[PDB]
Design a protein around this motif. Structure first.
Motif, PDB file in Angstrom:
ATOM      1  N   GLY A 171      22.139 -32.313   5.571  1.00 31.00           N
ATOM      2  CA  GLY A 171      21.862 -33.472   6.386  1.00 31.00           C
ATOM      3  C   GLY A 171      23.073 -33.154   7.588  1.00 31.00           C
ATOM      4  N   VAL A 172      23.715 -34.820   7.868  1.00 32.82           N
ATOM      5  CA  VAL A 172      24.933 -35.362   8.514  1.00 32.82           C
ATOM      6  C   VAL A 172      25.820 -35.536   7.909  1.00 32.82           C
ATOM      7  CG1 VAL A 172      23.843 -35.873  10.587  1.00 32.82           C
ATOM      8  CG2 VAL A 172      24.593 -37.093   8.388  1.00 32.82           C
ATOM      9  N   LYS A 173      27.228 -34.897   7.640  1.00 32.95           N
ATOM     10  CA  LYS A 173      28.374 -35.055   7.271  1.00 32.95           C
ATOM     11  C   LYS A 173      29.210 -36.444   7.727  1.00 32.95           C
ATOM     12  CE  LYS A 173      29.667 -30.211   6.162  1.00 32.95           C
ATOM     13  NZ  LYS A 173      28.541 -29.793   6.907  1.00 32.95           N
ATOM     14  N   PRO A 174      29.226 -37.286   6.950  1.00 30.46           N
ATOM     15  CA  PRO A 174      29.882 -39.106   6.778  1.00 30.46           C
ATOM     16  C   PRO A 174      31.467 -38.503   7.858  1.00 30.46           C
ATOM     17  CG  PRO A 174      30.021 -38.236   4.514  1.00 30.46           C
ATOM     18  CD  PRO A 174      29.566 -36.798   4.997  1.00 30.46           C
ATOM     19  N   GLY A 175      31.499 -39.388   8.585  1.00 33.93           N
ATOM     20  CA  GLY A 175      33.062 -39.399   9.425  1.00 33.93           C
ATOM     21  C   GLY A 175      33.817 -39.869   7.618  1.00 33.93           C
ATOM     22  N   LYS A 176      34.944 -40.845   8.605  1.00 31.31           N
ATOM     23  CA  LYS A 176      35.824 -41.241   7.852  1.00 31.31           C
ATOM     24  C   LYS A 176      35.707 -42.581   7.885  1.00 31.31           C
ATOM     25  CE  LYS A 176      39.588 -41.267  11.768  1.00 31.31           C
ATOM     26  NZ  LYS A 176      39.919 -43.067  11.395  1.00 31.31           N
ATOM     27  N   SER A 177      34.753 -43.148   8.819  1.00 33.58           N
ATOM     28  CA  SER A 177      34.568 -44.485   9.079  1.00 33.58           C
ATOM     29  C   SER A 177      33.019 -44.987   8.740  1.00 33.58           C
ATOM     30  CB  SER A 177      34.887 -44.902  10.462  1.00 33.58           C
ATOM     31  OG  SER A 177      35.777 -44.872  11.035  1.00 33.58           O
ATOM     32  N   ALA A 206      36.473 -35.318  -0.412  1.00 39.96           N
ATOM     33  CA  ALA A 206      34.976 -34.869  -0.218  1.00 39.96           C
ATOM     34  C   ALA A 206      33.736 -35.448   0.677  1.00 39.96           C
ATOM     35  CB  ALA A 206      34.630 -34.786  -1.808  1.00 39.96           C
ATOM     36  N   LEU A 207      33.814 -36.821   0.520  1.00 36.52           N
ATOM     37  CA  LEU A 207      31.945 -36.936   1.330  1.00 36.52           C
ATOM     38  C   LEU A 207      32.719 -35.919   2.789  1.00 36.52           C
ATOM     39  CD1 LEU A 207      32.572 -40.445  -0.104  1.00 36.52           C
ATOM     40  CD2 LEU A 207      30.495 -38.392  -0.521  1.00 36.52           C
ATOM     41  N   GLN A 208      33.105 -35.909   3.801  1.00 32.64           N
ATOM     42  CA  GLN A 208      33.585 -35.691   4.407  1.00 32.64           C
ATOM     43  C   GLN A 208      33.397 -34.366   4.421  1.00 32.64           C
ATOM     44  OE1 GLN A 208      36.796 -37.210   7.242  1.00 32.64           O
ATOM     45  NE2 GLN A 208      37.675 -38.024   5.600  1.00 32.64           N
ATOM     46  N   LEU A 209      33.410 -33.364   4.165  1.00 33.63           N
ATOM     47  CA  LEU A 209      33.053 -31.907   3.966  1.00 33.63           C
ATOM     48  C   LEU A 209      31.256 -32.136   3.442  1.00 33.63           C
ATOM     49  CD1 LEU A 209      35.719 -30.769   2.217  1.00 33.63           C
ATOM     50  CD2 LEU A 209      35.580 -31.208   4.331  1.00 33.63           C
ATOM     51  N   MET A 210      30.670 -33.282   3.091  1.00 34.07           N
ATOM     52  CA  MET A 210      29.358 -32.699   2.278  1.00 34.07           C
ATOM     53  C   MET A 210      27.856 -33.112   3.216  1.00 34.07           C
ATOM     54  SD  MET A 210      29.985 -34.946  -1.673  1.00 34.07           S
ATOM     55  CE  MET A 210      28.363 -34.211  -2.102  1.00 34.07           C
ATOM     56  N   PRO A 211      27.375 -32.315   3.584  1.00 29.13           N
ATOM     57  CA  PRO A 211      26.223 -32.852   4.184  1.00 29.13           C
ATOM     58  C   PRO A 211      25.525 -33.736   3.474  1.00 29.13           C
ATOM     59  CG  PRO A 211      26.882 -30.299   4.182  1.00 29.13           C
ATOM     60  CD  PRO A 211      27.302 -30.379   2.904  1.00 29.13           C
ATOM     61  N   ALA A 212      24.458 -34.434   3.681  1.00 29.56           N
ATOM     62  CA  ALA A 212      23.936 -35.537   3.729  1.00 29.56           C
ATOM     63  C   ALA A 212      23.148 -34.401   2.669  1.00 29.56           C
ATOM     64  CB  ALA A 212      23.246 -36.365   4.304  1.00 29.56           C
ATOM     65  N   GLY A 213      22.009 -35.194   0.918  1.00 31.11           N
ATOM     66  CA  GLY A 213      21.723 -34.174   0.455  1.00 31.11           C
ATOM     67  C   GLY A 213      21.946 -33.602  -0.027  1.00 31.11           C
ATOM     68  N   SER A 214      23.126 -33.230  -0.270  1.00 33.44           N
ATOM     69  CA  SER A 214      24.333 -32.105  -1.207  1.00 33.44           C
ATOM     70  C   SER A 214      24.187 -32.956  -2.168  1.00 33.44           C
ATOM     71  CB  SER A 214      24.921 -31.899  -0.349  1.00 33.44           C
ATOM     72  OG  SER A 214      24.994 -30.945   0.601  1.00 33.44           O
ATOM     73  N   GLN A 265      31.923 -47.953   1.570  1.00 33.63           N
ATOM     74  CA  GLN A 265      32.703 -47.108   3.420  1.00 33.63           C
ATOM     75  C   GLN A 265      33.628 -45.672   2.698  1.00 33.63           C
ATOM     76  OE1 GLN A 265      36.113 -47.207   5.166  1.00 33.63           O
ATOM     77  NE2 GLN A 265      34.721 -45.984   5.807  1.00 33.63           N
ATOM     78  N   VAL A 266      33.708 -45.165   3.496  1.00 36.14           N
ATOM     79  CA  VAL A 266      34.211 -43.115   3.170  1.00 36.14           C
ATOM     80  C   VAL A 266      35.361 -43.379   2.545  1.00 36.14           C
ATOM     81  CG1 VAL A 266      34.908 -41.415   4.292  1.00 36.14           C
ATOM     82  CG2 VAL A 266      32.242 -41.860   4.090  1.00 36.14           C
ATOM     83  N   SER A 267      36.673 -44.369   3.428  1.00 30.55           N
ATOM     84  CA  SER A 267      37.482 -44.858   3.609  1.00 30.55           C
ATOM     85  C   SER A 267      38.319 -45.508   2.664  1.00 30.55           C
ATOM     86  CB  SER A 267      38.390 -44.818   5.070  1.00 30.55           C
ATOM     87  OG  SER A 267      38.526 -46.292   5.187  1.00 30.55           O
ATOM     88  N   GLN A 268      37.530 -46.326   2.435  1.00 27.13           N
ATOM     89  CA  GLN A 268      38.027 -47.339   0.986  1.00 27.13           C
ATOM     90  C   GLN A 268      37.588 -47.161  -0.626  1.00 27.13           C
ATOM     91  OE1 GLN A 268      35.965 -50.192   2.859  1.00 27.13           O
ATOM     92  NE2 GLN A 268      37.273 -50.830   4.090  1.00 27.13           N
ATOM     93  N   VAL A 269      37.505 -45.554  -0.621  1.00 25.69           N
ATOM     94  CA  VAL A 269      37.317 -44.945  -2.452  1.00 25.69           C
ATOM     95  C   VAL A 269      38.319 -44.248  -2.249  1.00 25.69           C
ATOM     96  CG1 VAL A 269      34.754 -45.030  -2.502  1.00 25.69           C
ATOM     97  CG2 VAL A 269      35.747 -43.554  -1.479  1.00 25.69           C
ATOM     98  N   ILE A 270      38.416 -43.788  -3.307  1.00 29.54           N
ATOM     99  CA  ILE A 270      39.944 -42.757  -4.081  1.00 29.54           C
ATOM    100  C   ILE A 270      40.258 -41.876  -2.942  1.00 29.54           C
ATOM    101  CG2 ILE A 270      40.547 -43.294  -6.272  1.00 29.54           C
ATOM    102  CD1 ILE A 270      38.677 -40.298  -7.161  1.00 29.54           C
TER     103      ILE A 270
END
Ligand code: WRL
Length: 133
Positions: A40-46, A87-95, A76-81
């Protein structure tokens, strides 16, 4: 002093884990292992993500989990540790990844503590289910 012990134990763990098979070390010091690769798609910071996850300490103690809750979590990707944001920004959805987070990319020296003590290294299994813009 728990701060000093935790720092030494975490440093030892990360130093040993970097040699373990499948462990990828990032410039930040964040480490990860691919458990299941998604397409899947990789999430962005926003972006917002929906994930299944378990957080545990180096001794194996689980301190948080979406398991047997009947529902995934949304963040929200930017509001966690920082470890998660990275890590989330490097992960394709489904990973599903297992990430090893140095304390500086988590809660840090954290003089106080409770679930998370001072200089605490955190291990997370993260299954990225979906991404929303
Ligand atoms: C939002 C952020 C947060 C909000 C408020 C206070 C502290 N931290 N937060 C928590 C979320 C759960 O909402 C969870 C998953 C995402 C990474 C991380 C995280 O960034 N953690 S966690 O597993 O490290 C964790 C840490 C603690 Cl102190 C306690 C628990 Cl129960 C779980």
């Amino acid at each position: 002093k728990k701060a000093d012990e935790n720092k030494v134990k975490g440093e030892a763990f990360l130093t040993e884990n970097k040699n373990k098979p499948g462990v990828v070390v990032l410039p930040s010091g964040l480490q990860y292992k691919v458990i299941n690769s998604g397409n899947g798609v990789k999430p962005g910071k926003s972006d917002t993500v929906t994930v299944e996850y378990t957080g545990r300490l180096i001794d194996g103690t689980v301190f948080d989990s979406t398991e047997k809750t009947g529902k995934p979590a949304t963040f929200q990707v930017s509001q966690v540790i920082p470890g998660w944001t990275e890590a989330l920004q490097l992960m394709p959805a489904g990973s599903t990844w297992e990430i090893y987070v140095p304390s500086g990319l988590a809660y840090g020296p954290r003089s106080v503590g409770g679930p998370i003590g001072p200089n605490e290294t955190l291990i997370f299994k993260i299954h990225l289910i979906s991404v929303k813009k």
